[PDB]
Design a protein around this ligand. Structure first.
Ligand SMILES: [Ca+2]
Ligand SMILES: [Ca+2]
Ligand SMILES: [Ca+2]
Ligand SMILES: [Ca+2]
Ligand SMILES: [Ca+2]
Ligand SMILES: [Ca+2]
Ligand SMILES: [Ca+2]
Ligand SMILES: [Ca+2]
Ligand SMILES: [Ca+2]
Lengths: 21, 106, 193, 193, 193, 53, 53, 21
């Protein structure tokens, strides 16, 4: 059977405030 | 003779409870060194009325906090800012209210 | 087909209870005002839901696994704490309490209590008694410890304020309450309405 | 011979409730007039019988296997469709209903209901709950869900009619109700009267 | 407590359909006037009952073991031969027939048919199909073979006659129809109304 | 989240206590069937005020 | 869908709709999503919002 | 001794901005 027809992927990313050093 | 016992035994028991809310005073109601004292909560077991530890306190005569630790549970985001100092004074008679020099208080 | 047999029909589901409304500044002046929701957890207390529509067709019920759910409809920039607990004894009325801290403390003392900001979501579990006592499904009657298996109290700990520091006063809505329940009904019937 | 053990004493028996009376044409005017019998099924509800006399000498009871029974005193030529069900929630009162059809439907939907013509005989069972609760053997008091394990209702579906397709206007007596019961009492004592 | 499993919930019960009325002499004039009841046997066809109320809270249904039941409100002295069958193809309509004998024959040839005099009682079964298809619990819509698993027809073979060999011209009421059913619903939901 | 627990646990504890004194009624105050009831003390744990149970 | 025309019958042995948001956590609105297996069940005919929800 | 009298628990959660995908 036809595999991987319309495979979509998701990888969530956060977006904080005040990246500190 | 119906003699109640004579064993003065210690009953150690642990658990968390809830003192009160903290009310920062803002610019209007902060016009003095006393206004900067937000919480004056004695740590006597019998001081926390609604709790049940205080109720049990009445069932014994003496107590001793073998360990106590107050914990602050905030309700605001990191947008607001204000410094806070918290110290459990072991001498109740030491009253900061009598002080006027804010820096001395801090 | 004409069986005269009785048996528990344990069936699961979910339901939408109502939209909470944080009380704000104006409508919040005393303690009892801080009680946003007083909703019995009797199956037949939520009118249009599936749970109550089913309950109408039995005598009794017993939450084998119930849990109220909070889903916020606001950003994370707003600030207010919430406490929720389900008292398994209906006749315990905290409205009589004046001291707010005493109220929050008798809330937290209940085992199934929960505290959460109204910007995130959490679950309020119903704790089940240990005697197997079944509860009647119909509307509340002479006594309540027969019908109601619990009561959901929702509390406003802090005051409601916004991105800036100014506290809101318009009594807006924060989220919604859902019920992910599992109940067992015993006796097929119809209750009057 | 001075034992203090509490043990269930299951014991069988039979009894005699009362005579019923179909309401006829003139007196059948609404939905509640179609209720010929509203008779609890608590042990201590039938004084002159044996079950109540025995109940007087225990504190609690529980219908292990009960069955009401109808015996007519009329010929087959007459016809009237009755419904008889034992509601296990004594506070459920159909008299508050006005829609006849809904009354008959809430009577029929009960699992222990039977429909029959008032010229033949039947046996109305009592479906017992699951949680093993015990009931109280005394007179009715503050609440009823403590004493009454059930309530017997006897309905009149069709209008009483004679040999021909003609109704009757006499409001006559039809038969009698009996109770074939086996009950388990828990705590020996004597209740006032 | 937030499971999404779909499982059949087989549950028993009883209900009350309606009262029937034999058509008599004057009104019995053709083949279709001999049809006293044309009543579907879909769950959601009897509103005030319990089966439809439960159906409202599922999407599909399937009669596991159903049985219609006749209870008369008339004496034995009267006589009228009835036929009752549950056609599993709701679109099959006998009203289009004119030959009385063919109507009675297509009523009798059905496997779940019974013939009886309107003074006694019977139990009309519903013969279920084989392919395991499920039906829909909603009101009637574009098609019927999706919702209605059956259709109950009640016929009048012989003319209503009294004690003697004489007919009657009143078109009186005879009895009532009950349903002793056990049904399996598949998908929890709520259907509009 | 600060979630209080969800364990409905049983706590069994034992001990003796003190209900009240019994006052026999004598010949004067015993003039009825009610006068012969000297003690009506409910056994609800919350009925013994001074006690700690 | 185009392939669908190359066969006669179909059956979703598994389907799952996924929501891919485009907003930050500043905005707020509750959403309900349910795949009704009976197409003829039309919510539009409803007026009571609470009944719909 | 009576254990677990009034045990409370805390589990902090962050709340960033612009969860990205
Ligand atoms: Ca000091
Ligand atoms: Ca309580
Ligand atoms: Ca019990
Ligand atoms: Ca009821
Ligand atoms: Ca009832
Ligand atoms: Ca008693
Ligand atoms: Ca056919
Ligand atoms: Ca539908
Ligand atoms: Ca649907």
């Amino acid at each position: 059977t036809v595999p991987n027809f319309n495979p979509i992927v998701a990888k969530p990313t956060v977006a904080p405030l005040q990246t500190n050093i | 003779r119906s003699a109640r016992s004579d064993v003065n035994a210690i009953t150690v028991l642990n658990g968390s409870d809830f003192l009160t809310t903290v009310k920062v005073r803002g610019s209007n109601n902060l016009i003095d060194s006393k206004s900067r004292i937000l919480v004056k909560q004695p740590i006597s077991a019998s001081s926390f009325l609604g709790t049940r530890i205080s109720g049990l306190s009445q069932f014994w005569e003496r107590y001793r906090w073998h360990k106590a630790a107050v914990r602050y549970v905030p309700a605001v985001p990191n947008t607001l800012a204000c410094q806070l100092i918290g110290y459990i004074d072991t001498d109740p008679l030491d009253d900061p209210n009598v002080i006027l020099d804010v820096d001395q208080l801090l | 087909a004409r069986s005269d047999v009785n048996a528990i029909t344990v069936l699961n589901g979910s339901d939408f209870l109502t939209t909470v409304k944080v009380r704000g500044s104006n409508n919040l002046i005393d303690s009892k005002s801080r009680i946003l929701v007083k909703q019995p957890i009797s199956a037949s207390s939520f009118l249009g839901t599936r749970i109550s529509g089913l309950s109408q067709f039995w005598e009794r019920y017993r939450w084998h696994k119930a849990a109220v759910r909070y889903v916020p409809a606001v950003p994370n920039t707003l600030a207010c704490q919430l406490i929720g607990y389900i008292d398994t004894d209906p006749l315990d009325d905290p409205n009589v309490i004046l001291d707010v801290d005493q109220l929050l403390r008798q809330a937290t003392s209940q085992v199934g209590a929960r505290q959460w900001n109204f910007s995130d979501t959490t679950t309020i579990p119903l704790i089940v008694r240990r005697d197997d006592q079944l509860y009647y499904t119909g509307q509340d009657k002479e006594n309540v410890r027969f019908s109601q298996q619990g009561v959901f109290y929702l509390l406003q700990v802090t005051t409601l304020l916004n991105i800036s520091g100014e506290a809101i006063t318009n009594d807006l809505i924060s989220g919604s309450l859902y019920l992910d329940w599992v109940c067992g009904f015993s006796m097929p019937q119809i209750n009057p309405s």
